[PDB]
Structures are given as structure tokens and as C-alpha cells.
Write a protein that binds this ligand. Structure first.
Ligand SMILES: [Zn+2]
Ligand SMILES: [Zn+2]
Lengths: 332, 332
């Protein structure tokens, strides 16, 4: 019900990428029947999306109706494409970022853009970041919770962080590329459980990798209330204290010292979790985020926030829009 | 500082297992410096152990300083050995279970036994369970969060649950067998993050698999506060509503509705976490547990509970002792 930091969109169409690049494993969007499109990844329909996933005029009507003022638009994490050749992911990121830039310029009072990067190639990612910031005007980018066998602690990724820091370019971290098969194939576990564990790992990798210590001005927001982190910080903090040989090897400060140093969205569904999220992360560091237009997201944006009896107005306004603005470096 | 539901022990010595069974991957206790030893992978040294890990007099003295009345003894989860040939695994169980019984006989007012079981072979597991309850007098058993490739929903396991429920045998589910390599090899992650993830999966697999609905007298306690579950129940439940096709094919009730139907231990380290845990799981369904003798556990049994200015003495006593007695169907 003011700013939604967490929302995904696709271009309506893009060229056959297998043809474009020479190898398969990409996703396309097919428009078969009305107000619906199939996402495929070699072979199968991966997911069905409705027109709010591509048509910004539809997004505006839904936003008007829900009282959402601005959505920060980012691609669908399936498009990250960190597994492809570096130049080809770059080519794709340019197409998705421009398309994103084009939607934003059409409604620059209702949308901001969070771009995508070829993270598997930190020199290309820096360049594409500069362009997103300087040429495209995006306040930030969305990145995966990991990049192939790299976690957010990886040294290779360090230039990317120094660039983001320097460019005043915010990072929205989104869990992606969990295990989808084996034990994880049933009960939508990769989404229910594997996503919040991915995020929990990412936060851990960034704290214990020293990322926040190297780059104290890096602005970073994690997805879904930081996964399990706000609840298991005790275990993480105490275990860090207990086994510095395994945990304090790169950054000697206890994880608990970085509570306050990063943001999460507020997408945790119940009041008790939200209250704990703010207690643990702080009321300046939690941002309304919705996962629009996906069904695992908040159906009525901001409704969980508005219903918290304990929060005064100032707090509610922080969580709905204020914190978003600090995290993006923009003005109301 | 009355009862500890989560405490692990090993016999002081056991046969060489590479011999007795005739293939590797087992675990052995090697002592070196009088009241100090090391556990071994067959491959290499994983974990340094103190005297308290095998010596019942040593445990009692510490229980006396720390104000612990009773410990529920279970084996070290690395002993589960669900990956091995069944009959072999059974052998190891009877050996570990008789040791456990033999230690309880020495201090019947200070220890109870929680058995292990050849879970990868259901009917053999069943009979060993009847033996643990009828002949050894155990009030329950400890089993892992999954069995090789079966998660706790597997129908193969339903005979074990009916049997457990028949016999009034409580189950303590412990996370084990997380991912140990790849991305998970740094920063003590399989412990700090993989374990809570394992447990969250087990809660989901039992709720969604039909286990609590098909066996309404099964008494089940989860390790470490139930992992992420008390914090992410919101996500897991909203998701279940949004995709009953993906999540409800085996049991149709919303996971939300099984809050109350199971216990967790209180081992969450932080007070905010412990308050959340009781707000979600229930004041009657949280049991003090320490993970004694391991460094990742609570060093002062029940100090966290005692520090909760918001719990009255009735509630402090539920968490310390009254919930464990109820879970195990024992009297004072
Ligand atoms: Zn999302
Ligand atoms: Zn344990």
C-alpha cells in the first residue's frame, strides 16, 4: 500500500534465444490463448503467467486498486541465466534492462527499475551495472542468492560490490536456483523451504565473507524477510562464537553486529513473523515487498503491515514506503 | 535445569565396524589423552570429543553443577547409518540400544533412553522398537529427518508410525545427513543452516504427508526449535492454500492447523526466538533441550528459559520439565 520493492515482470516477447546464441536451456514466453502465456524451458511449460506479468497497463490498474504507488520492477529470477556463456547472458541482460528501462520511462512516477547482470562474469557485470545506473537511471539491481558454485562471499564477486558501492547502486538479493528434484520434488518445497534457506545462506555468506565490512556503504536487501535468518540468528551467532576456526576465518565480527546493516522485504505472511523481523532487523531496515504477480506473494499489498496493532503510524509509514526510499536513495 | 530432552551419548568403546560388517564409512571412537578422544569417518577425524560424551559419572557431576535432574540419552546422529545394509544397521542398533539401557539401569532416576532404529528397513525397525519399549523400557526413540531418499511422508514408514503410536512410543526427530560438500563446505553451514532446513522439511513432510492426521496420538518432537518452521509457517501455509495441486495431494488440511499437534525442543539460543517459538508452537509443546555435550548446544541448561521475565513460574516449569514428562508419558 505505498512502495512494493519486490515485483517481477517480463517483456511481452523476445527472440528465440537458442537461435540467437546457439545452444538451448533458455526460457521463452508463448502467447497461445487470451490473457495468459506459457513459460517454457527446454521441453515443458514451467509456469503459466497472466497479462499482469508483462502488460504494464494492467499492472497500473491492479496498483490503483490495491493502493500501491510504486512497484520496483525486476525480471523473473528464472531469467538470471548465470549458467550461460558470459557474453550471451550480457546480451540478454541488455535486452531485459532496456525493456525494463522502457516500461519505467512510460510511468516514472509508478515504477523504478532493478536491473539484471551477468554475475558469472564480474567485469561484464560491472559494465552493465554502470550502464544501468548512468544510462538507464536504475537505482539498483536484483541478483541471485548464489552464482553457479559461487556464494556471495566469493572474492571474484568483490569488484561487482565495489562498483555497486561506488555507483550508489542498491542490491536486491533474490533466492534462485535451489534444488528442484530428488527429495525436493514434492510439496513445492523448493519455494516453501528451499527459497528461504537460499536466502539464509546468502546472508551468512555475506556476513562471514566480510562483504559488509569491506563495503560499509553497500546497500543490500534480502528477499522474503531474509529467509530463516531472523529466527536462526541465535544459532548462527552462537555457533560463530563457538567455532571461529570454521566461521571467523574471513570476518572476525559476530554476525549479530551486522543486524542493522542490511534490509529485508517484509514478505513473511504472519504478524508474529513480521514483529520478529522488525525486532531483529530493525524498523528502518524492513521494506514492503509483495512478489507480485506471483501467487506465493501478498495478495493484498501492505495489509499485514496495516493490521499490526502495536506499530504506530510512523513505523507503518517506514515499512510501506519510507524504508524503500532510503534503500533506493530516492525522494517522495 | 530439570529435564534435558536433547543429549547425545556413545558407548565408551565398540567393535571395529569395517571388519564386523565388511565395508567402510562407519564411525569409531579413538581415545588418546585420558578423558579425551576423537571420532573418525573411516576416512578422517570429524569431531573432537570429551569424557562427558561416554562416561556416565562424568555426565552426572556436570548435571549436578548445572542443576539438571534428567537427561534423555540418544546416540550421536552420525550413528544412524540408514545408508548401510539393513541387518547390519539393526545389529548396530541393538548394540547402541543395550548400551543405552545399561546406562539407564545405572542411574534410573537420572537418565531415560531414546533408541535408534534401522529406519531404512521398516519392519525390522518396527520390531526393534517393540524391543526398545517392551524389553528395555524406553519411552521413545530418536530418528533422523529423512531416511536415505524417503522423507518422513513416505508410505514405507507408516508401519513404523502405527507401531510407534500403538506402543505409546515418542519420537524425537533429529536433523542429519545435510549436504556436507560443495557450497555447503564453508562457514559451518550444514550445522548452522542445513540442520534447521532439514527439520523444516521434516515438519512439512509429516504435515503434508498425512502423518499427524492418520496417527492423532503420535508424539513427535523436532530438534532445534523446529528449524525455520516457527518463523516460515506463514509462507508454508499461504503456499499450501495457493497451490493445493502441488501441496495437498496426500493430506488436505492447512499446515496452520497442526500447530499444537507436535513438540519442538527449546534450543534456539535467543530470547526473541524463544518467545516466537512458544507463541507459535505453544507453551505446552516446547521442551528444554541442550544438545549436550556439543559446543553448538546451550552451555547453561535452561539459562535462556530462566531469563524470560515474561514467562511466569508455571510456564518456566513447563519448558524445563513438565513438557518433557508429557511428551514421554512419564510421571515424577
Ligand atoms: Zn520474487
Ligand atoms: Zn543433537
Amino acid at each position: 500500500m505505498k512502495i512494493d520493492i519486490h515485483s517481477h515482470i517480463l517483456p511481452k516477447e523476445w527472440p528465440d534465444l537458442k537461435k540467437r546464441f546457439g545452444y538451448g536451456g533458455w526460457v521463452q514466453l508463448q502467447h497461445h490463448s487470451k490473457g495468459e502465456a506459457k513459460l517454457l524451458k527446454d521441453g515443458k511449460v514451467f509456469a503459466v503467467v497472466r497479462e499482469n506479468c508483462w502488460d504494464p497497463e494492467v499492472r497500473i490498474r491492479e496498483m490503483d486498486q490495491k493502493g500501491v504507488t510504486v512497484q520496483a520492477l525486476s525480471t523473473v529470477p528464472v531469467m538470471f541465466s548465470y549458467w550461460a556463456k558470459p557474453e550471451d547472458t550480457l546480451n540478454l541482460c541488455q535486452l531485459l534492462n532496456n525493456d525494463l528501462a522502457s516500461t519505467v520511462v512510460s510511468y516514472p512516477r509508478r515504477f523504478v527499475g532493478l536491473g539484471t547482470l551477468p554475475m558469472q562474469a564480474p567485469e561484464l557485470a560491472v559494465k552493465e551495472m554502470e550502464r544501468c545506473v548512468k544510462e538507464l537511471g536504475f537505482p539498483g539491481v536484483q541478483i541471485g542468492t548464489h552464482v553457479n558454485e559461487w556464494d556471495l562471499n566469493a572474492q571474484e564477486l568483490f569488484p561487482v560490490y565495489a562498483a555497486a558501492e561506488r555507483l550508489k547502486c542498491s542490491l536486491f538479493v533474490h533466492p534462485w536456483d535451489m534444488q528442484m528434484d530428488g527429495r525436493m520434488a514434492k510439496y513445492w518445497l523448493p519455494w516453501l523451504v528451499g527459497m528461504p534457506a537460499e536466502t539464509t545462506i546468502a546472508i551468512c555468506s555475506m556476513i562471514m565473507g566480510g562483504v559488509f565490512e569491506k563495503f560499509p556503504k553497500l546497500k543490500v536487501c534480502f528477499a522474503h524477510g531474509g529467509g530463516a535468518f531472523p529466527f536462526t540468528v541465535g544459532r548462527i551467532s552462537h555457533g560463530f562464537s563457538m567455532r571461529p576456526d570454521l566461521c571467523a576465518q574471513d570476518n572476525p565480527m559476530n554476525p549479530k553486529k551486522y543486524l542493522g546493516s542490511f534490509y529485508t522485504d517484509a514478505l513473511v505472511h504472519d504478524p508474529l513473523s513480521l514483529k520478529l523481523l522488525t525486532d531483529v532487523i530493525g524498523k528502518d531496515k524492513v521494506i514492503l515487498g509483495t512478489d507480485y504477480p506471483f501467487p506465493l506473494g501478498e495478495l493484498e499489498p501492505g495489509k499485514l503491515i496495516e493490521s499490526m496493532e502495536e506499530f504506530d503510524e510512523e513505523t507503518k509509514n517506514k515499512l510501506k514506503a519510507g524504508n524503500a526510499l532510503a534503500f533506493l536513495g530516492l525522494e517522495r
